[PDB]
């Protein structure tokens, strides 16, 4: 099933579940899936399989 990613403000350092690199920045550092909690870079979103 597709994910439902929504922009998220990460309060502690957090790494992208797709590529492994840090979700760097002060705010809105990436996207969190509302249904499974996966965290991704904005630009990793299209690389993620529809396996929510
Ligand atoms: C030496 C690190 C160089 C890269 C800088 C990345 C960074 O600063 O944020 C990654 C936070 C920072 O850890 P913190 O210093 O904020 O404390 C959390 C550590 N622990 C989870 C064990 C309680 O670390 C983690 O939570 C887990 C990943 C640690 C290895 C990543 C290189
Ligand atoms: C905090 C100390 C740890 C240093 C960071 C370690 C690290 O993970 O570096 C790698 C990620 C790369 O993330 P990027 O935001 O460049 O994009 C990765 C996703 N995609 C390639 C698909 C677009 O890039 C960064 O995070 C570095 C900061 C980039 C700009 C800061 C002025
Ligand atoms: C004096 C103003 C400094 C200029 C920096 C721009 C800024 O205000 O912060 C913006 C970024 C978002 O990243 P940026 O908009 O700087 O670049 C995009 C990075 N990526 C395409 C990989 C997502 O949002 C953040 O939270 C990071 C804080 C700044 C780090 C970037 C150098
Ligand atoms: Zn999901
Ligand atoms: Zn990523």
Numbering used by the authors: 229 to 280
What text comes from the article?
AJH-836 is a high-affinity synthetic DAG lactone with considerable promise as an isoenzyme-specific PKC agonist. The DHPC-protein interactions involve hydrogen bonds, both direct and water-mediated, as well as hydrophobic contacts. The structure of the AJH-836, where one protein chain has a bound ligand and the other ligand-free chain interacts peripherally with DHPC, highlights the versatility of interactions that Trp252 at the “DAG-toggling” position can form with lipids. In e, one protein chain is ligand-free (color-coded green) and has three DHPC molecules, labeled 1 through 3 that cap the membrane-binding loop region. f The versatility of potential Trp252-lipid interactions, exemplified by the Trp252 sidechain from the ligand-free C1Bδ monomer (e green). In addition to non-polar contacts with the hydrophobic lipid moieties, the Trp sidechains can engage in H-bonding, cation–π, and CH–π interactions. The structures reveal that all four ligands bind to the same C1Bδ site as DAG. AJH-836 is the only ligand of the four with no additional ligand-protein hydrogen bonds compared to DAG. In the lactone complex, a combination of the E isomer and its “sn-1” binding mode affords a favorable arrangement of bulky R1 and R2 groups within the hydrophobic rim of C1Bδ. This configuration likely constitutes the structural basis for why AJH-836 displays its marked selectivity for novel versus conventional PKC isoforms.
